[PDB]
Structures are given as structure tokens and as C-alpha cells.
Amino acid sequence: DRVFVWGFSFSGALGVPSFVVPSSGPGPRAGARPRRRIQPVPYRLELDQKISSAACGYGFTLLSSKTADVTKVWGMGLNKDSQLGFHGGGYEYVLEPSPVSLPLDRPQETRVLQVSCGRAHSLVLTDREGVFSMGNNSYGQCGRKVVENEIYSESHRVHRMQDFDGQVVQVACGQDHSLFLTDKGEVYSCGWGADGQTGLGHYNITSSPTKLGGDLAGVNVIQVATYGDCCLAVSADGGLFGWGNSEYLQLASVTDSTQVNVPRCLHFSGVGKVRQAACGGTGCAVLNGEGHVFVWGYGILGKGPNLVESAVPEMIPPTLFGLTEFNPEIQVSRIRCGLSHFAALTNKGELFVWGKNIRGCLGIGRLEDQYFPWRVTMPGEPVDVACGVDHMVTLAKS
Amino acid sequence: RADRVFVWGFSFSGALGVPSFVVPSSPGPRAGARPRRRIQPVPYRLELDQKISSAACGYGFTLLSSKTADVTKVWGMGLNKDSQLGFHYEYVLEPSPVSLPLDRPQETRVLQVSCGRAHSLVLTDREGVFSMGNNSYGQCGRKVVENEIYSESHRVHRMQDFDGQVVQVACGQDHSLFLTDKGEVYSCGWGADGQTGLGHYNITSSPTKLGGDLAGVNVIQVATYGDCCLAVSADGGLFGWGNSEYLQLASVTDSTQVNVPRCLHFSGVGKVRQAACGGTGCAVLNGEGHVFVWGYGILGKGPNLVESAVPEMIPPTLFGLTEFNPEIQVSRIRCGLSHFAALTNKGELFVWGKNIRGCLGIGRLEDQYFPWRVTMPGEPVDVACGVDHMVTLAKSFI
């Protein structure tokens, strides 16, 4: 029903053109006023589309609808690598949600299910035509061969990927790599490999979606999570797996290596069965079967100023998400990660955020970091959120 | 960060201090009354406007004390058939002011409370130690009176003639230990197992200084709760006396009733910094913050370790600890009669052992063969352990 945006505005990633020029709200006698580079509180994006999926890249945004109409994806923000596809004019920054073209075989039948965005590339998942990629391909993260002198600005190139065993049901962009999850419970990857983030047993560039093995072999993966150079995966029976960057204790419980290129099972007694995972630049979060959130890695993890790093998941007190004797049914039903901040939706329809407050990306008015979960207020019930580096998008109901 | 007091375990003798725990009670205004059980299986917040700095769990009763200069300094609840809560009903259902016959009630401060099977000790800063409750074995530090009636008695004995100021008191089952600032230990009470450590097996009705291997030793801590006793010296030495039916002192003697303090040298343990002693089990904390357990029972290393004469280290992983932050460690160990508790630098409480009437406070009522984290709506600072209940002194998260 409703789309809310907030955070860093000056790259156009929030989609309101008046955010970057002197302007005023309605009020016939009100003069224009200067804007800052931040929208510090949730703002309702005016877009007459039914958005079912949102993604925040590093300074840009994708929004997608499940409609059978030919226009299914909109984008705004930084576009110097064509991460939003091609857009007329020589505009490096798209200031309002603009239609993103897709070379579909049947544009009036195929539907878009999900969007994802990394540092400079994007992925678009369709129900019947595979995965589409656009943006920077300097590291093969778009799933096609690296062309060494390719110019990525003002590019019409959109790659199509269908060489998967089964339908792809989730796509997830890392910083300079991409993850693909099939309905057979198997993970594919491509892109930069220096930290092992592709999980293919080596450290080189991968320019075609390649199935991961290691501890994921024969495992029914139901979710993958990434955004920086670290990756997590959740299995159907509650198992947790990780690979990629481990400079920040993300995978230190199983290895001394800071660059893990083979997926490793992560056994944490006391967590129970993991149902969701989220992964930021230096931190990680999981949600277990009791609706409890656990955080680890490095940063402002959510248990006050004294918890800065850990190799093992640390439980966030459920009372910080509103649990009391008068509200004993409260638990978290969805977790998401930005690059350095965290987000949790409770079964009461309440959004909590914490972590680094990078240019008002927490959306709580005040600009300081939040070392404990903090409720975000907006004229609607949050259903899901996408978290960027310095901005956020919320999909909400009226 | 206000102070919080959490209680759990067996509630039907009143030891938890919530009168609604023993009668049908109820959420909202439309919630009907529900039957109570005899157990409170998860931590519950005891509402108290006073600041509790010391808590003690007797066998079915509780003492809480404040350092305030105000005249009311101690509160008690639970079993009181021997006046172990002082004069006040055989069971006190809510925290009730404990009467002390202090010379200067507006200046003297209470520093510590301790409770045994049916007696209590109250340590003040400048008026000595006060005792109350049963004295059938001289455990209150006064002569046994043959046919004394201990119920509904205003008797509170004062002990004010030690060599130095007393800095710690510890109640055993039917004996009492006192530790002075000269590093010396006094004892009184039942002596059949040698728990008073005075070189004989007879009743001792007046606090008497211990010798043996403690002569010339600077003791900084004593530990007891059943019929076995342990002491810790300033340089990391460990000493023990009393009951040794369950291998507690079997490394130095085949006697099961040791009435002289014996040095306990364990090369695998470092310098001992803390000791805790239950009915049949023992635990120590060394200079690296590592926990070792021995004796008999559900010691904490799985179902296969049930008895040992030598301390076995509990793997730090079971406390959520890693070697990448060796400054994060166990900071406090405590023993109940049949269970164990440990607090870490991360502000978390771990319990294990026999789960007697929900005294572990982990919801489920089964025994715990490994350390298990206790969830509570606050950060634990210290705990007291009884036979079948527990008290935690905590702080609010915010």
C-alpha cells in the first residue's frame, strides 16, 4: 500500500526531487527553505504503483511490482554505472522513481518477483524468464564475462541468466558479488572472490553463476544473506552457514582465516534453529524459532556501548523489542541488515532499528547512533524494509 | 539504569516474596484469575523501592539487605518457623522488615547477609555479626539451650569480639563461617563432619579461629552451604575441610569427615580466585576466569561427568566465551545445594546442575548438564542460590 523513504537524500536515492533543491511543503504563504542532505524521518513516496519488493544499493534504490503491465521496476539514485539501467539525459543521478527497462520475451505476462542492489550493480528476479542484471561488471558480478574496457555509464546492457538447476527464488547482491538461491535449495554465485565471498573454493573472479559446495552440499538452503563481503545461509532444518570476509569475527568461531572461500557450518549452541539471517558489512544477525534476535561480528550490535565485537551470536533482550508481562506474545518476525545498521519487525507490526546512524539512515529524527533497538514511527504498519548504507526504504500498509 | 531484583524457583514457602504466587491471580482487566503452581519457572521482578546490595537464599527462605543508613536495612521472606527471618505466620509471604538490635541504627550499615538450613547471619560494618534462627547446634554462635523454642522469638545474638573486623560471613547447613580482615577464619555450629574445621567433631557454640593448613595464610574468601567448606588465599591457594563423602577432599585424604583444614593443590588449576561449594559439588574460578568443577552431581560437563576428586575445567565455549577476547571471562561463580551459577564479563547468567523445583529459572524443568544462559529482563550483577530458589541482583538495560 505505502512506501516510506528516509536517510541520505542528495544522490536521489529517496526519489523526491524537491529533496535536493530549496523548497517548502504546502502552505501558500510559506517561502522556500534550504534543504540538508538528509531526510531524517520517514517520508511517504508518492508513486501510484503497488510495490512488493524494494532494494537499497550503495546510494541508489530499486522498487518492483508484480504487475503484468509492461512497467514493473522503478529506480532512483546514483547511476554512474547504469545500476538503474539506461535513462535518458546525461544525468548521473536519477532524482525520481524512473521506469527500468527489461528485455523480456513476454512483457505483458512475465512478472518481477524481487530486486536487489549492491555497490554498483542490480539484480531483478522474474517468475519465468530468469534473473536480469545491470550496472558495473568490473568483477563479473553481473554474471557475464568481464569486458576489460567496457564503459558502464549510459549503458543499455542488461544480462539475462537462466542457467540454474531449477527456478531462482531469491537474489542477493553483495558489495561486488551476487548470490542466487534456487527452489532446489542450492546457492549460486558470481563476482569478486578476493575474500572468498563467492564461496567457490578459490579467490579469483567468477563471471558466470556457479553452484556452491562445501558444507552446503546436499543442504536445503531456504535463505541467503549478504551486502558487504560476508555471506550467510540458512537451511530448512535451522542450520546456519557462512563464508567470505571474516576480518570482523563473523566466522571466527570455526576458523582463524579472515577470507573463507568454502561455505562452513556455523554451530552455535543456545541459538537453536535459525529461521532468518541478515548480514552487513562487519556484523551479522539471526532470528531463531522463538522470535529471538542474535547479533555478532563487529560494530554497534545492539546491546549497548559495551558490546562492540563478538565471534558468537549475542541475544538481544526481548524486552527491548517491547516484551512485557502485559504484552507477553511479542517476538520479532523479520530481521534485515544495512551496511552498518540493523532492523527488526515484531509480530505487533512495529519497526525497530539500531546500529550506526549514517546520515539519518535510522529514520528516528535524532542523528546519533543507537546502541539499543529503537522504534521508528510512521503513518503505516511496516511489512518489510530494505536497508542501504545511508538510506532506508519501508514497504507499509495503510 | 535502576536496580532490579529477580526471583524464581520454589514459591510456596514464600521465599520469592510475591504474595500472589501462592493464590490464584492474574494481564488485562478482563483476564480471569488463574491457578498458581508451587514453582515460578522463569525470572520475575520483585518490586522493591529499597536498594538491595546483598541477597542470601536459605533452605526455603530469603534475606535481602541494603547498605542504607536508614533504620530499616534487612528484609526477609519465606520459612520462619525458627525465626530465621527474626520476629514477625510460619511463612512470610512478602519482603518484611527484619528487626535488628543495633546500637546506632541511623549510622551502622549492613554489608552482607547469609542463610543456612534454619539460621541467618547479618554482617554490619561497625557493630559485628548478628545471628538469628535455629541454634540447636550452636550455629548462631551462642550456647545451646536445651529446650529452646525458636518460633516467634525476638532473639538476635550479637558477635562483636573477633580479632579484626569481619568482612565475610557464610552459612552452612548447620554451621557458620566468619572471615576477618586479618585473613583468618572463625567457625561455630555442628561439627560431626568436621565442617567447623576445629580439629574435633563436637558442637561449637562460640566462634573459634581455625588453624591447620590455614595458620599464617591470608584467606580472602570462604565458601559453604552444605557440610563441606572451601577457602581461598590471597596468592591463589585453595583449602578445604568438612564433609568428603562425595570426593570433595579425596585428593588429599581418604577420610569422609575432615575436621582440620587441608591444602588442596591442583596443578591443572591456576591461581584460585573464587570458590563455591554446594552439598556434594565444588567449583573454583582461576586467574584466567576459567571454571573448574569436581565432587559429585550434575557437575556441568555433560551426563558422563558425575564424580571427580580433581577439578575438571568447563570449556569456556559453553559460557559463550572465545579465546579472541580472553579479557571476557567468567567473573563470578556461585553454588546452590545441587546447582551452579556463573556470571560472565558480558553481563550474562549461566546455570546448570540439578533443577530442583525450577530453581534454574530456565522455563523447562529438566536438569541441565551443561551451562545454560538465563533470560531475564535486566543485566545480572550477582546471584544468590538456595536449595530450590534463586535471587538475582540486576540492573535495567537502559
mmCIF file of N, CA and C in Angstrom, chain B residues 145-207:
data_model
loop_
_atom_site.group_PDB
_atom_site.id
_atom_site.type_symbol
_atom_site.label_atom_id
_atom_site.label_comp_id
_atom_site.label_asym_id
_atom_site.label_seq_id
_atom_site.Cartn_x
_atom_site.Cartn_y
_atom_site.Cartn_z
ATOM 1 N N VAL B 145 20.761 -23.978 74.178
ATOM 2 C CA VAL B 145 19.812 -24.036 75.283
ATOM 3 C C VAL B 145 18.881 -25.211 75.019
ATOM 4 N N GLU B 146 18.828 -26.142 75.978
ATOM 5 C CA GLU B 146 18.321 -27.492 75.737
ATOM 6 C C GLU B 146 16.957 -27.496 75.052
ATOM 7 N N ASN B 147 15.959 -26.879 75.677
ATOM 8 C CA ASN B 147 14.584 -26.925 75.191
ATOM 9 C C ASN B 147 14.111 -25.567 74.679
ATOM 10 N N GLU B 148 14.995 -24.828 74.013
ATOM 11 C CA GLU B 148 14.617 -23.524 73.486
ATOM 12 C C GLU B 148 13.537 -23.669 72.420
ATOM 13 N N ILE B 149 12.561 -22.768 72.459
ATOM 14 C CA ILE B 149 11.528 -22.674 71.437
ATOM 15 C C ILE B 149 11.908 -21.528 70.509
ATOM 16 N N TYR B 150 12.193 -21.855 69.250
ATOM 17 C CA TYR B 150 12.774 -20.898 68.320
ATOM 18 C C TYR B 150 11.739 -20.104 67.533
ATOM 19 N N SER B 151 10.475 -20.514 67.553
ATOM 20 C CA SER B 151 9.440 -19.803 66.816
ATOM 21 C C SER B 151 8.978 -18.573 67.586
ATOM 22 N N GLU B 152 8.681 -17.505 66.845
ATOM 23 C CA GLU B 152 8.142 -16.264 67.404
ATOM 24 C C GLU B 152 9.026 -15.737 68.531
ATOM 25 N N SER B 153 10.326 -15.678 68.257
ATOM 26 C CA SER B 153 11.325 -15.287 69.241
ATOM 27 C C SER B 153 12.029 -14.022 68.776
ATOM 28 N N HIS B 154 12.178 -13.064 69.686
ATOM 29 C CA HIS B 154 12.892 -11.827 69.399
ATOM 30 C C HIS B 154 14.404 -11.980 69.499
ATOM 31 N N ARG B 155 14.904 -13.198 69.696
ATOM 32 C CA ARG B 155 16.331 -13.400 69.920
ATOM 33 C C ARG B 155 17.134 -13.023 68.686
ATOM 34 N N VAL B 156 18.082 -12.105 68.868
ATOM 35 C CA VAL B 156 19.092 -11.789 67.863
ATOM 36 C C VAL B 156 20.413 -11.657 68.606
ATOM 37 N N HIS B 157 21.326 -12.595 68.374
ATOM 38 C CA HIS B 157 22.612 -12.616 69.056
ATOM 39 C C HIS B 157 23.607 -11.732 68.316
ATOM 40 N N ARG B 158 24.461 -11.050 69.073
ATOM 41 C CA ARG B 158 25.485 -10.181 68.511
ATOM 42 C C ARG B 158 26.861 -10.767 68.794
ATOM 43 N N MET B 159 27.702 -10.821 67.764
ATOM 44 C CA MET B 159 29.081 -11.286 67.881
ATOM 45 C C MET B 159 29.988 -10.137 67.464
ATOM 46 N N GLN B 160 30.738 -9.589 68.426
ATOM 47 C CA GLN B 160 31.478 -8.349 68.214
ATOM 48 C C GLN B 160 32.905 -8.419 68.745
ATOM 49 N N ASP B 161 33.447 -9.618 68.958
ATOM 50 C CA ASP B 161 34.755 -9.770 69.593
ATOM 51 C C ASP B 161 35.626 -10.733 68.782
ATOM 52 N N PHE B 162 35.859 -10.374 67.525
ATOM 53 C CA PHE B 162 36.813 -11.058 66.665
ATOM 54 C C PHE B 162 38.131 -10.293 66.645
ATOM 55 N N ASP B 163 39.191 -10.986 66.230
ATOM 56 C CA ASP B 163 40.489 -10.349 66.011
ATOM 57 C C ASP B 163 40.436 -9.650 64.658
ATOM 58 N N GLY B 164 40.011 -8.392 64.674
ATOM 59 C CA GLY B 164 39.788 -7.632 63.459
ATOM 60 C C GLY B 164 38.315 -7.571 63.102
ATOM 61 N N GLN B 165 38.033 -6.839 62.028
ATOM 62 C CA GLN B 165 36.673 -6.700 61.531
ATOM 63 C C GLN B 165 36.333 -7.860 60.605
ATOM 64 N N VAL B 166 35.102 -8.349 60.711
ATOM 65 C CA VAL B 166 34.633 -9.423 59.845
ATOM 66 C C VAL B 166 34.256 -8.832 58.495
ATOM 67 N N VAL B 167 34.727 -9.461 57.419
ATOM 68 C CA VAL B 167 34.466 -8.979 56.067
ATOM 69 C C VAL B 167 33.617 -9.938 55.247
ATOM 70 N N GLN B 168 33.421 -11.175 55.702
ATOM 71 C CA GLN B 168 32.537 -12.111 55.020
ATOM 72 C C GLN B 168 31.962 -13.092 56.031
ATOM 73 N N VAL B 169 30.677 -13.399 55.876
ATOM 74 C CA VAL B 169 30.021 -14.468 56.619
ATOM 75 C C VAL B 169 29.445 -15.453 55.613
ATOM 76 N N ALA B 170 29.439 -16.730 55.989
ATOM 77 C CA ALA B 170 28.909 -17.782 55.131
ATOM 78 C C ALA B 170 28.227 -18.823 56.000
ATOM 79 N N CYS B 171 26.945 -19.060 55.742
ATOM 80 C CA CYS B 171 26.196 -20.088 56.445
ATOM 81 C C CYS B 171 26.330 -21.417 55.717
ATOM 82 N N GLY B 172 26.684 -22.458 56.464
ATOM 83 C CA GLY B 172 26.495 -23.821 56.022
ATOM 84 C C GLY B 172 25.124 -24.320 56.433
ATOM 85 N N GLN B 173 24.932 -25.632 56.296
ATOM 86 C CA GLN B 173 23.653 -26.225 56.676
ATOM 87 C C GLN B 173 23.355 -25.971 58.148
ATOM 88 N N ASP B 174 24.259 -26.395 59.029
ATOM 89 C CA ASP B 174 24.069 -26.207 60.461
ATOM 90 C C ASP B 174 25.339 -25.681 61.121
ATOM 91 N N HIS B 175 26.131 -24.909 60.381
ATOM 92 C CA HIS B 175 27.322 -24.266 60.910
ATOM 93 C C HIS B 175 27.470 -22.903 60.250
ATOM 94 N N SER B 176 28.401 -22.108 60.772
ATOM 95 C CA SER B 176 28.613 -20.747 60.301
ATOM 96 C C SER B 176 30.103 -20.476 60.172
ATOM 97 N N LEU B 177 30.475 -19.730 59.133
ATOM 98 C CA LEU B 177 31.852 -19.313 58.913
ATOM 99 C C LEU B 177 31.937 -17.794 58.934
ATOM 100 N N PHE B 178 33.028 -17.281 59.500
ATOM 101 C CA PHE B 178 33.293 -15.850 59.582
ATOM 102 C C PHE B 178 34.725 -15.606 59.129
ATOM 103 N N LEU B 179 34.921 -14.605 58.273
ATOM 104 C CA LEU B 179 36.237 -14.267 57.745
ATOM 105 C C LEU B 179 36.576 -12.829 58.112
ATOM 106 N N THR B 180 37.728 -12.636 58.752
ATOM 107 C CA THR B 180 38.145 -11.322 59.217
ATOM 108 C C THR B 180 39.061 -10.643 58.197
ATOM 109 N N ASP B 181 39.296 -9.346 58.413
ATOM 110 C CA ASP B 181 40.229 -8.609 57.566
ATOM 111 C C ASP B 181 41.685 -8.925 57.884
ATOM 112 N N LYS B 182 41.949 -9.789 58.860
ATOM 113 C CA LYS B 182 43.279 -10.333 59.085
ATOM 114 C C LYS B 182 43.532 -11.595 58.273
ATOM 115 N N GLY B 183 42.589 -11.988 57.420
ATOM 116 C CA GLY B 183 42.743 -13.195 56.631
ATOM 117 C C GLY B 183 42.572 -14.478 57.410
ATOM 118 N N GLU B 184 41.800 -14.450 58.495
ATOM 119 C CA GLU B 184 41.608 -15.605 59.357
ATOM 120 C C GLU B 184 40.135 -15.991 59.393
ATOM 121 N N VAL B 185 39.878 -17.273 59.642
ATOM 122 C CA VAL B 185 38.537 -17.841 59.587
ATOM 123 C C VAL B 185 38.113 -18.285 60.981
ATOM 124 N N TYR B 186 36.876 -17.955 61.345
ATOM 125 C CA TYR B 186 36.213 -18.463 62.537
ATOM 126 C C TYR B 186 35.042 -19.347 62.126
ATOM 127 N N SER B 187 34.641 -20.243 63.026
ATOM 128 C CA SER B 187 33.515 -21.124 62.748
ATOM 129 C C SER B 187 32.793 -21.469 64.042
ATOM 130 N N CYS B 188 31.549 -21.920 63.891
ATOM 131 C CA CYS B 188 30.763 -22.430 65.005
ATOM 132 C C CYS B 188 29.622 -23.266 64.445
ATOM 133 N N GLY B 189 29.103 -24.165 65.283
ATOM 134 C CA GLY B 189 27.938 -24.954 64.942
ATOM 135 C C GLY B 189 28.220 -26.449 65.007
ATOM 136 N N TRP B 190 27.451 -27.200 64.222
ATOM 137 C CA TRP B 190 27.592 -28.649 64.139
ATOM 138 C C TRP B 190 28.974 -29.023 63.612
ATOM 139 N N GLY B 191 29.547 -30.092 64.161
ATOM 140 C CA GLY B 191 30.893 -30.474 63.780
ATOM 141 C C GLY B 191 31.084 -31.939 63.441
ATOM 142 N N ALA B 192 29.983 -32.674 63.259
ATOM 143 C CA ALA B 192 30.073 -34.123 63.094
ATOM 144 C C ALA B 192 30.844 -34.517 61.841
ATOM 145 N N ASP B 193 30.738 -33.734 60.770
ATOM 146 C CA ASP B 193 31.527 -33.975 59.569
ATOM 147 C C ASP B 193 32.822 -33.175 59.550
ATOM 148 N N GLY B 194 33.117 -32.437 60.618
ATOM 149 C CA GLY B 194 34.284 -31.583 60.646
ATOM 150 C C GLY B 194 34.117 -30.263 59.934
ATOM 151 N N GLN B 195 32.875 -29.853 59.652
ATOM 152 C CA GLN B 195 32.644 -28.655 58.852
ATOM 153 C C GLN B 195 33.097 -27.381 59.555
ATOM 154 N N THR B 196 33.197 -27.388 60.885
ATOM 155 C CA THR B 196 33.735 -26.223 61.577
ATOM 156 C C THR B 196 35.256 -26.160 61.504
ATOM 157 N N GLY B 197 35.910 -27.272 61.180
ATOM 158 C CA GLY B 197 37.347 -27.293 60.947
ATOM 159 C C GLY B 197 38.205 -26.976 62.153
ATOM 160 N N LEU B 198 37.822 -27.463 63.331
ATOM 161 C CA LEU B 198 38.479 -27.091 64.578
ATOM 162 C C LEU B 198 39.281 -28.230 65.199
ATOM 163 N N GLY B 199 39.455 -29.340 64.487
ATOM 164 C CA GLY B 199 40.237 -30.449 64.993
ATOM 165 C C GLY B 199 39.472 -31.466 65.808
ATOM 166 N N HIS B 200 38.145 -31.375 65.851
ATOM 167 C CA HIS B 200 37.317 -32.322 66.582
ATOM 168 C C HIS B 200 35.960 -32.398 65.894
ATOM 169 N N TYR B 201 35.085 -33.254 66.422
ATOM 170 C CA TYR B 201 33.775 -33.492 65.828
ATOM 171 C C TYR B 201 32.629 -33.028 66.722
ATOM 172 N N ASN B 202 32.912 -32.190 67.710
ATOM 173 C CA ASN B 202 31.897 -31.782 68.670
ATOM 174 C C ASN B 202 31.249 -30.462 68.265
ATOM 175 N N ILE B 203 30.083 -30.203 68.863
ATOM 176 C CA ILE B 203 29.402 -28.932 68.667
ATOM 177 C C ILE B 203 30.279 -27.796 69.178
ATOM 178 N N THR B 204 30.303 -26.695 68.431
ATOM 179 C CA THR B 204 30.989 -25.471 68.830
ATOM 180 C C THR B 204 29.957 -24.355 68.911
ATOM 181 N N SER B 205 29.805 -23.766 70.097
ATOM 182 C CA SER B 205 28.760 -22.780 70.344
ATOM 183 C C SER B 205 29.296 -21.359 70.463
ATOM 184 N N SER B 206 30.540 -21.117 70.048
ATOM 185 C CA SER B 206 31.139 -19.795 70.101
ATOM 186 C C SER B 206 32.153 -19.709 68.968
ATOM 187 N N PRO B 207 32.149 -18.621 68.179
ATOM 188 C CA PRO B 207 33.056 -18.535 67.023
ATOM 189 C C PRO B 207 34.513 -18.748 67.401
#
